[PDB]
Amino acid sequence: DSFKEHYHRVHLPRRLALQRYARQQSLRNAAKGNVKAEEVPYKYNRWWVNEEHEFVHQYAFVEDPEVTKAKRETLPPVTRENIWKEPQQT
């Protein structure tokens, strides 16, 4: 029983509860008949130059749950023949 694992002992269930309180938003944005995944804006400034003058890049990856729900639900199409019949060059 140090400081920190007692801290998380108490607070991680509270973080879970708090994000549950975050999930109910979508829920009354469901119940009233709206169906929308709340969108995340695309950020055009991901390319930058720092003080030592070199190229720095930021990676933003956006997960689409309507794609995921389709991804798990049905098979992918047949693997193209360029893939397995030719090896991966080392």
Partner 1 sequence: RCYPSLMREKDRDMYHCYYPYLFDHGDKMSLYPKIPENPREWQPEQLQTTYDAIREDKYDAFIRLREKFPELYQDTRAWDNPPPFGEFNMFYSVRFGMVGVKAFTCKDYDELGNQFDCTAFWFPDNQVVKHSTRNGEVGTDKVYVGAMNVPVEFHKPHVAAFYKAAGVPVKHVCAGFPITPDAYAPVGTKLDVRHFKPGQEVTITFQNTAAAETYQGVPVWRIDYKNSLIYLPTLLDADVGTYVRFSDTINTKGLTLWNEHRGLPAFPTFIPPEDEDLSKLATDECQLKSPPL
Partner 2 sequence: ALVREQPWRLSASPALFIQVLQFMALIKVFEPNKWFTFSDHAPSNRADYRHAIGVNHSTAFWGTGEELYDFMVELLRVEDDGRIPTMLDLCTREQMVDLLSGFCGVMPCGKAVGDVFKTITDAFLRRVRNDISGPWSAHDWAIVERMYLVTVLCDAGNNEILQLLL
Partner 3 sequence: EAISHARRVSWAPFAQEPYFEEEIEAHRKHHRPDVYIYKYNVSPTHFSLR
Q: Which is nearer to partner 2, 21 or 59 (CB)?
A: 21
2 binds, among RNA, partner 2, partner 3, none (CB under 5 to 8 A by kind): RNA
DSSP 19-35: HHHHHHHHHHHHHTS--
Could you say which DSSP state residue 74 is in? S
Phi first, then psi: what are they for 85, rounded to 5°? -75, -15
Q: Please state the separation of Cα 86 from the chain's center in Å.
A: 33
Stretch binding partner 1 (CB under 8 A), from 3-11, 32-40, 71-79? 71-79
Which uninterrupted H or E stretch holds 81?
Answer: helix 81-84
Looking only at residues 16 through 45 of this chain, which bind partner 1 when binding is defined by CB under 8 A?
A: 16, 19, 23, 41-42, 44-45
Phi first, then psi: what are they for 55, rounded to 5°? -80, 120
Candidate list 14, 16, 24, 30; residue touching RNA; CB under 7 A: 16
74 near partner 1, judged by CB under 8 A: yes
Chain positions contacting RNA, by CB under 7 A: 1-5, 8-9, 12, 16
